[PDB]
Amino acid sequence: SANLWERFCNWVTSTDNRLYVGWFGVIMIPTLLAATICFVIAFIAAPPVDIDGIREPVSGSLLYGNNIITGAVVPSSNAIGLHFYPIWEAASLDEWLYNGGPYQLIIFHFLLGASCYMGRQWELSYRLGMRPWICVAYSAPLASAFAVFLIYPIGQGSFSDGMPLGISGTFNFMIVFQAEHNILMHPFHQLGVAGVFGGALFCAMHGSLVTSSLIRETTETESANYGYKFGQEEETYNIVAAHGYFGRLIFQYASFNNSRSLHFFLAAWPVVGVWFTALGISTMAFNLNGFNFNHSVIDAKGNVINTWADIINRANLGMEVMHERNAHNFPLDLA
């Protein structure tokens, strides 16, 4: 034995593994297995959770009357707030499942692993001699999960205010958010949808332009895909014919001819846009909300002349006035 530990480190770091369990992986792989296994069990058999700390259990598991679309893993109690609630902090599991214990076990392990997943997306790139930064693109979707699962709860003072782990549970997070923060009227969110819409747009743009300008090497009755072999030397499409068409669609200088400048833009746009959307949720986690143009334009006498901004406010009040029915005892919603 060349030295056990020396070998161990050579295996872990080995680039000959089907799946690159890295150094970050050593933390990732266990944390992600705990999160997934706990989730799957929760989502299927977990019992009702008193999310709002007002003894009014919300069942979100299949076996307890839910389906895929409605079902979810409910956030820890509001009675717990930001307190750490590990299994060994409960008199029993029965108490732990009632106070939304699983939620924390899941969010913490996931966020942890999902971070190492980024750390790994660097490591392998290092071990393979390729440039880094790929992990920096993945920093945007991660920074969102963080914003939605940890930053917002820290800011709002409770994990019960974090986004639930489910379809409908997510829609709840949105509808309520909008009511309390008016996100649609916030610059960061708008940049977010710009990045996402734009992304999908450009994704279609590139995708189409390229596939449409492929050099013919296929039969009339043979998949146009076969005209490419894994491990080619030259390109499989006429990037000069591509630019030729797109340059005429709009106008020459408003078109890419440099594949490298194209692909940077292709990556830069969404990542930057999503970065801001993540900063939006993380900023509005401290109650710095969207623009409030309520009763702005008023007439010569003082009457209030409504704008679409006001019609939005009514829709918002409805959400405000109806969310968490029995949870409020006082006039102002400061939590």
């Binding site: 389906n67 895929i68 679309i69 409605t70 009755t221 998949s223």
Partner: protein, 37 residues
């Protein structure tokens, strides 16, 4: 009869099968809720 000369063989690679099944399964996971309504 004369062997019709307009026929070609049909193909579906392994990846396509996978890509296929993934689509069918997930669609089923998406619509089952509304089927049971």
């Amino acid at each position: 009869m004369e062997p019709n000369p307009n026929r070609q063989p049909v193909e579906l690679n392994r990846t396509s099968l996978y890509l296929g099944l993934l689509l069918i399964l997930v669609l089923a996971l998406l619509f089952s809720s509304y089927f049971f309504n």
